[PDB]
Design a protein around this ligand. Sequence first.
Ligand SMILES: [Mg+2]
Ligand SMILES: [Zn+2]
Lengths: 586, 49, 1341
Amino acid sequence: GKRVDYSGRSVITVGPYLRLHQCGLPKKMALELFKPFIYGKLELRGLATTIKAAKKMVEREEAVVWDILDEVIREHPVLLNRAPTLHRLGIQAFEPVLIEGKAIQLHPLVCAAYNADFDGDQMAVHVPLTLEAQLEARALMMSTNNILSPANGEPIIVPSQDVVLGLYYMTRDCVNAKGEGMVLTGPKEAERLYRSGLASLHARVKVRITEYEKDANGELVAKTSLKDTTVGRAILWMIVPKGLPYSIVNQALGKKAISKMLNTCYRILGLKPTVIFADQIMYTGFAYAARSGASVGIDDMVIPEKKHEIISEAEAEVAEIQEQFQSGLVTAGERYNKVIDIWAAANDRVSKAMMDNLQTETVINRDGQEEKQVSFNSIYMMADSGARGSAAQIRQLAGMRGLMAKPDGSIIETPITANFREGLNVLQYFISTHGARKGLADTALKTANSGYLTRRLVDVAQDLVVTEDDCGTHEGIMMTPVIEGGDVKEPLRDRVLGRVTAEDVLKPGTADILVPRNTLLHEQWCDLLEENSVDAVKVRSVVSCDTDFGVCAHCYGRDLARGHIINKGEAIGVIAAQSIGEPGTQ
Amino acid sequence: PPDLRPLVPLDGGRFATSDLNDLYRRVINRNNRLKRLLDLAAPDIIVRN
Amino acid sequence: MVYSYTEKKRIRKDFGKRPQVLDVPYLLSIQLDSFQKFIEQDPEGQYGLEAAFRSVFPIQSYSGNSELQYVSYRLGEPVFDVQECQIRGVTYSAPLRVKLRLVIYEREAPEGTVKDIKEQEVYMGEIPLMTDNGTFVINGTERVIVSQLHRSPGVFFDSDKGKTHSSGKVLYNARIIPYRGSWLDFEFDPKDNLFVRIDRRRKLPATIILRALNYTTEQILDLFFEKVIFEIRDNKLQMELVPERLRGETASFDIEANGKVYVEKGRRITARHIRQLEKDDVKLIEVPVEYIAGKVVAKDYIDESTGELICAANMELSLDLLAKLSQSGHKRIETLFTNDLDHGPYISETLRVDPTNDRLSALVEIYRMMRPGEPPTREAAESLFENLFFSEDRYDLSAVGRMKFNRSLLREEIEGSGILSKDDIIDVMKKLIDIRNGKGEVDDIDHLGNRRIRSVGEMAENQFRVGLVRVERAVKERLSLGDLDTLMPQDMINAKPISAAVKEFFGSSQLSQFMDQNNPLSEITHKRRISALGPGGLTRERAGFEVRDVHPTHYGRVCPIETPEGPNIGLINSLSVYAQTNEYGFLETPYRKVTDGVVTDEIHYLSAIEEGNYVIAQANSNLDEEGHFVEDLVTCRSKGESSLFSRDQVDYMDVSTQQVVSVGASLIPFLEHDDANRALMGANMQRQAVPTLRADKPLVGTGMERAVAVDSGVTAVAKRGGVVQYVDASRIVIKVNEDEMYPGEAGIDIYNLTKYTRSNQNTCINQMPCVSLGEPVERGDVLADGPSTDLGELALGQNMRVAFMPWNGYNFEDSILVSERVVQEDRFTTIHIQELACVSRDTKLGPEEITADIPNVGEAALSKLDESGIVYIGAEVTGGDILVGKVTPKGETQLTPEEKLLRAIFGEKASDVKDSSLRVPNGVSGTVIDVQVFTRDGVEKDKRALEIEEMQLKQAKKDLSEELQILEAGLFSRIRAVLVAGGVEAEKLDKLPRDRWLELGLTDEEKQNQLEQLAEQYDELKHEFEKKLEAKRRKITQGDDLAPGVLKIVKVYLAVKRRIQPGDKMAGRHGNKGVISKINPIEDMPYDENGTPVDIVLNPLGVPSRMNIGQILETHLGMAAKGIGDKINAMLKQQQEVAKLREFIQRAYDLGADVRQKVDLSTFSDEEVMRLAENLRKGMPIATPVFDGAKEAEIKELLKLGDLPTSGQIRLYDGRTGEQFERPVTVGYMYMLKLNHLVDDKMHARSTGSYSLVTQQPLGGKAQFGGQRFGEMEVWALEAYGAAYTLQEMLTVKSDDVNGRTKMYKNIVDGNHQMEPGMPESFNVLLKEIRSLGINIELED
DNA sequence: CCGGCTCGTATAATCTTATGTGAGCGGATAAC
DNA sequence: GTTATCCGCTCACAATGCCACACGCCTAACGAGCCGG
Ligand SMILES: [Mg+2]
Ligand SMILES: [Zn+2]
């Protein structure tokens, strides 16, 4: 670890107007970094002769220098870094956009990959300065080239909490609103109805949609129909590209739904529509999250009406078990077990009652009498969309909270009968402090142990590089989908997606070559292997690869974080050690 | 090479010493004292010590 | 009811329902009581310096009959008072005087009378005193000693099960921890042999340390075991029996008596058969002979006829020895009673393990354990074993050690010696054997009956005793050859090691920390701090996990929620609110004595051990007005476990609902609606809130900020009650009421408020007056608002209008948007104060000058300087300009032995000049507010230093003239009033000066003559004021001493003003951080239907994830407070009548359930009401106690009193589109802080800077103009891509290749992007220090 | 009139809340 | 007996990264210096 010239440090800040391949750079710090490029551009254009004239001109900060600096920036990328680097997405390269400020702006979709807060997290800046370094930082490391993760083939550009709330609030329905049941021409007329205030954002309506489907072999097929949908869904359809079918935006669109929206858009179309589609999603998600106005208030946490008598019946039952212990019929251990069972049952009943009271209380007039629907409550939209929180956190807010366990390892008799909307008294808060400090100490030591194990694994696997193409053997392993005895945990599709077959696995129709012996199990081919219900597939591993001083290519299969088979040189031992050692904190 | 264990320039008076320089000074003092004791036909107990 | 004269300025509306009975004590009591206990004239010498002088002295030579004894001690007056000591640089010391009496005897008579006694006041050392705020002053700065939490002196019986031998068998070690001395441990091996060790050496059998105190083996077996008596009947002998010994056994034979068969063979002995023997009362039964086949004879037996040793003590018996004792007639035979369950033969096995046999051999064996190779000699081993335990010099338990050691053995008295005894060690062995048997249990460590706190005075006297021991060794070595009758006891007491030890501990220990002066909260929570690190305790990487969790006896003694997080959690605990240090050093906490039915008000204090016997009610238990538990079963607790008890069963009740927490988290309103993690983060982030330009009270605060802001030191409090007589911006002069004047010449009071000066975190400590002229104040009331205070209320940040809504993504995870109205009202602007010094140094080649003559610089940079070489007071300078012009001589090669004579006198001491002027660092700016000049005694002062002299001299004249003018007027009134007697003429009086009134002739009464004598007494008082002025000017005029080498010092302060900008960190009191993302204009804000914009947009998504739900209740209550404020403002702008205003304030102050204030405005007499309205018109301040909060419905009714909506949600419009935000949003007033993680302390950059010396790498840090550490994991990351050339630049061109990097720099400036690889210089460094070992290492080819 | 004092400076000394490994070596331990 | 193993004791070696900040880094006695008594 050598310290490095042309570097810098700041605190960061969001800036949601950026594109994906650029970042906000402070003006003064960018004049400070690129001083020799500035000196060269000044002595080229005749505006100075010596180096000292250029030093005086750039210490006066004259108005020619900013135009010169903008000529210096234009196509010259910059590396950014966050300090506890775990996995290889820790440092990435962007282009700069100049900012009159003192902080670094940073595109919000990337912020999950850095695992960055905005709680005061600091970042650092390095400069590629030669020609090959600029060209590597543009090709191998620009942030439009890192969508899928190297640990598993999943997009790392999932839209986060606020965009989730915006898109979930746009694409819903309610059974009586302005302009319900009218008819429309395009999606743009639905937009023009939303702006004028004539029709509301979610009122059901038949529209006309043209959609393109590329089942024709390399071209697009138009198809025009009338579909029963929503004004918000017709507005969101205007940023979907040509490829996808309309049933991707007809549902309620929580978090996993838009994640697989991005994933199917990556599968069918390519790279550039995936990047530009993530940008349009981020922009319109923030826009309609602004126009929502989704607040939170103390009257958005509905207490159940039946909490009181459930606690009263639980107290009657524990008094009865206490009397059965007092007469001497039941021993102390079974008394303990009966009490913990009945408080578990009472907690589950209270949680069921509060969730049933929140999710569907909203009754609205039909233009007939009354109906039922999913609610428009605040925290229920914050949980049901999967933006922040689970059933557990929203359970502790209004229903009673769990059973706190003492640090000895036992679990206490009397559970915390209160929620957070009501007040906790002295003893119960003093009990909750145990779990607080226990979790904090566990995090404090877990960090260091994960760091040391990652250090040792990347020491082991460092000298190993994919070095030749085809070792050409006929060994390997046999994969079957794992089954404990409960449910099948991992199917055969997920494990043996993208690994090169060892032997020709025959069809269940015997003596029929279902797969050639030396091909790559890509996705369509994996489905056509799945259809005949194959239980065991033999496949080439790395542990039986033949190549001296390295690993052959077909013995490793396709690469993660990109699409095709792996190129000769990818230092797979280091990315493997990082992929094991990265989630060790969790 | 003595640039690779440099003598710390303080402000006012004396220079602050490193650790290697103190260890080499101790070794050289001990070596000179033993060489002089070999030069003067010392008794065996003292040269052993 | 009746309120103070500042308490009537505003009233905080107090919710909370419980009647309190005990107010908050003085929050800094522990520091002041400790250091007051340290230095005090103490009879009986149990503690303080007197104990340290009684422990060592008298000191005497090696029977040379020269001896030094001790008379008394005295502390000299401080030569320097506090503020100028903080300016100049020294400690706030105090000198010490010791009256020593050197005696020498007359020879051939040791009890003979001494012939020479010599008494002196020897000077030794300097002991630092304590400021009135509990702090110390060390090197110009102000430092605090943190209290320590360590293990108790005494004894412990730990188990430590598990990991030994992997068999599951537990162990039982017993440790004795002395207060000053050496350890003592007892252990078990899995062979059940009982071992001893001392000071963690190697193991020994405990039999030898039991023998070494003059014990025979039969005495050992008599003490540690009982007896069974066999009597030899001549055939098939008998056995005595108490039948309870047979319990839990298997009968080896047919147990029977009087023909009645009790137990058959093979049957285990039942308690039924035991009761049969109880009824039958059997004393003897008749065993078979072989039953003694395996037992052990207790004591030794010889042949009474021949002297043959038949069997010794602790011998395993056989039938041959039984036959021989029957032949010798030894019928009465003792036998060790053994068992596997109750009385285990544990000692006898160990006594058969050990090799060592008797007393002198035992002393030899211990003496060989302690030091190997030394000659085993009788007297040396005897002296070693005496000095380990049985002497005062090197084994001292305290009183606390004797306390715990008599308590943990069920003794009776609690006063014993500071040494051990025979009974102590054998009782430790007996108790350890009993614990191994099964009765009794272990003592867990985390329980606070075993962990004491050390305050400052005890650590101070320990270090002082260490220094006294070193000086004692030196003076004993000197006085051992004491043979001179001219020796006086200054010749022998070297005052260097005592001062070295005292200044070592107070200056740079591990427990002498800086005090964080950026809140009054930060100071008062840093002094109240209980630490577990340092000497005597553990370290932060060897503490495990059990000492960090919450033991269930932290209740009311240690705050559960205030702690640092990160590396050291649970070691730096903060002290509770009502906690008191015990008489011995444990932590006692208050409780209320309860009789049979009546909860009384007689408060008691309880230790950590006494609490686990009684029954204690929880605080919020509803009561009567007479005092009765109104329910029947009450939530209470007995021993670590809360439960539900009866009504005529409780004994003690809590004092208040505050006592669980500390002062750092009793200031969070609605704390009881928060997850404990976020309460921890809020309680950590309050004490980093930087102070603001204009301070501002909080609307929603707990009822605690008045005691915090007063009981700290940042505000000034009137000591005596009176009338305000003079108020300037600088000082306040108070006339004292005549009831509070002690009758000899009391007069007035003067408070000199501290102006803009430096704090330790470079923030601006300030004081301002808050009383008007001619206004009454009362004793114990505030006068000067310090930093972040407001009318005697702690007030850290400011409170603002906040809307919870997502606004265009500018608040994505935790970011905060701020409108420009917060900037234009400059209400987070912060003053900072930097300090820069410059010294003139006595180098070679000539000295250095402070002159204004600098070559190679322009005239314009010399303009801000005066002719003396120093910038003026108040010249607004920026980064780069010259503060102080200093020049250095530069020869370089002159070498003439005559030219240097003329250059040192005639040649100005200046031949060729190198510029070494103190310049402003880069970036920083500001306004020079203060310059200090310090000149060595001997150099003549420069004229600017003389200007400072004259200014300070006029300052010294002014105040003394003020006191003379105010003092002489009483005797002026007296000469006039006695001149009334006899005859006075007032028209003739006032035409001529006052001495002429004094010399106005009148017939001599006795009263006028005594008052004339008092007139010359004020004349000599005037002479005394003259000598006061002379005493001031001899201090000011005289030059300074300095460090060896320095001529003069110039100190320059600067002050700079920091506005707010995107990047700073603001955060509420509930743990909700944020970086200011954008800074919007006013018209892009969400405005409500009335038109007023909203200052700050938060993000709602942060509320359901982390359960900090109390902030929304704070938001609603704050909107209710400002809602009352707007109606009060509307009633004052219309200037309505005070009766209606009185009525509205009264109706706003009743409002709710059974609150305990009950104010009534029928005593405020139509002027306090208007002043109270002028204070309340910006909002009505509201109190909320922590665990006695305001319910939801009362917030609803207070929102109903104003015209606000009940739901707390208002329709909000849009700044950009002018449309409506559809659902209603939440607006309110939240109180926010500004933390000192400012962006202009972090944004740091580098293109090409400096380099280090050893390896040619760039330096690190911001100040040294460094580059970032592109560390190891980032290299793994670049290897993980296909990046190859970029790794080569980050490894070689950017650093450690010298020719490579200069070639690269020239190549960039030329406009060609190539590179030159080279080879790093640090690798050649690695080669040159591997070759420094015996390792050849080269490079092939 | 040399060092008594006073200084320049070169250089020696009586803990005590940790865990988990591996790895080796000395003392007991069970056979022809 | 004597030989090939088994077991308990003692001891070296590891424990994330980065940042700021701040204050610390000898002297009683052996070879010289000044000049007083
Ligand atoms: Mg963060
Ligand atoms: Zn292979």
